[PDB]
Amino acid sequence: ITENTSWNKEFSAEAVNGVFVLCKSSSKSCATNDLARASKEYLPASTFKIPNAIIGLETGVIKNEHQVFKWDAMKQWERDLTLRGAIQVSAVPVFQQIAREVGEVRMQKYLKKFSYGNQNISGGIDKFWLEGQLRISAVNQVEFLESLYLNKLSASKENQLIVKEALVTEAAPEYLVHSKTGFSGVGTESNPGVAWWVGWVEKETEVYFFAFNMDIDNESKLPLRKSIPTKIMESEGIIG
Amino acid sequence: ITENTSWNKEFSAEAVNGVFVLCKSSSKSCATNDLARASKEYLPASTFKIPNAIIGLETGVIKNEHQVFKWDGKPRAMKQWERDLTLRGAIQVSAVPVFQQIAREVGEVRMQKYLKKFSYGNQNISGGIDKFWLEGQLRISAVNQVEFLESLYLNKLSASKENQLIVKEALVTEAAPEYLVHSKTGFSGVGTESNPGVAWWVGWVEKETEVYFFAFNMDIDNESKLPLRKSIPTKIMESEGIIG
């Protein structure tokens, strides 16, 4: 992995502290604006829905791709959702329940198999990824996503494929994006939260893996988690 | 399958002779503008890339979802096809030569077997292994397309779940958190004024926790009318509240 400090320009205009990791073809060819931060580990927040969904399917907690999660202070948490819907929209109770049913022993087992961050799930079985001790780096997110892309995670190919379709966020004949956002909450200047955007882009016959994170201490800065990576990817010729 | 005559309103303007079949939840609850035409069989054209892809994967002709179909640098009928393509790309751009080669490698015996398993139209593959779905004797109706697509959606085709899932992602054409469309077009040609070609749009829509299966075909003798294969069904679906 090489460092491209010229990418810092994109963070500076907004006084944002963050990192972008971009890899062409495989994780053996990565570039980042900040080597140090690229390997620093942060709360995954909702990016954890990816491993959580795979584990849910593997353990049988989630029956199949067509399972409907029925609603028994947020409007979104009062509607019926498909697996894809639960992943792509706010659905805190759904994944809290999935995590509880999976249980700490099984959860720990799968995060070991997945080499997922610091593999520290202390903090409560239904919130370790948001308020607990779990941390993962941008580099580790790219490695994890690459394994998923290739169906190399320790899970059935079927379940990996199911979760992959659930992650599709942009579609054109020769351009397909699988992605997932995360946000731990708006923190303060001295104690910021973290915001993420991770995924991969298939452009023609090439593939690019990416992971972005930034410190967030202002609610209005949240959209930068998509615009900063987009501008960098544009400059690399991926978007056009 | 009841008939919705009000839907003809979308066909009258362009003097289009066609049919739209729309099913909510399953093929046991369908509606159409034309009962007679709904079960009439036509050349699948480009919609055949769906079963062709599944069969290619099943027989091992296509290795897996990441197989690249390399361009040899030789002229193709469409400039859009003169490049390396993934399986999804080849389907989405309707790269005929890629699928003709797949069909050749599959072979008549295996092709026949799989179309029987899939209950695919008249199952007649006469006319040449690389042209039966384009210029040959293969025929399928709008109702049959919906039945076939429902099976695919449910992973009920006689093929691995893995392979059905691969082709499903390849068919995604519209994506939003609570709205997902899988679809494929077809266009046999303009034929003649007396014997016109056929245009298709088939697929399914997932909106919130509901699913809608659809199949559209129309007679076409002028290429300029092609976009109607998507606009007519879209207008009907939008009128039914099926929109993102």
Q: How does this model look, in words?
A:
The complex is a heterodimer of chains A (240) and B (244). With 240 residues, chain A is α+β, with helices and mostly antiparallel strands. Chain A is built from 9 helices and 9 strands. Chain A has a single domain, classed as Beta-lactamase (3-Layer(aba) Sandwich), CATH 3.40.710.10. Chain A has helices spanning 9-12, 35-39, 49-59, 83-88, 92-102, 104-113, 138-150, 157-166, 224-235; strands at residues 2-3, 18-24, 30-32, 68-69, 81-82, 168-172, 175-183, 193-203, 206-216. Chain A has a 7-stranded mixed beta sheet, sandwiched between helices. Chain A is globular. Chain A starts with a strand and ends in a 5-residue tail after the last helix. Chain B has a single domain, classed as Beta-lactamase, CATH 3.40.710.10. Chain B has 9 helices and 11 strands. A 7-stranded mixed beta sheet of chain B has the order 1-3-2-11-10-9-8, sandwiched between helices. A two-stranded antiparallel sheet of chain B has the order 4-7. In chain B, a hairpin with a 2-residue loop joins β8 (172-176) and β9. Chain B is globular. Chain B starts with a strand and ends in a 5-residue tail after the last helix. The A-B interface holds A 65-66, 68, 79-82, 84-85, 88-89, 150, 157-158, 161-162, 164-165, 168-174, 176, 202, 204-205 and B 66, 68, 83-86, 88-89, 92-93, 154, 161-162, 165-166, 168-169, 172-175, 177-178, 180, 206, 208-209. Chain A: Its main location: periplasm. Chain A: Its EC number is 3.5.2.6.
What would you say about this model in short?
The complex is a heterodimer of chains A (240) and B (244). Chain A is of the alpha+beta class. Chain A has helices spanning 9-12, 35-39, 49-59, 83-88, 92-102, 104-113, 138-150, 157-166, 224-235; strands spanning 2-3, 18-24, 30-32, 68-69, 81-82, 168-172, 175-183, 193-203, 206-216.
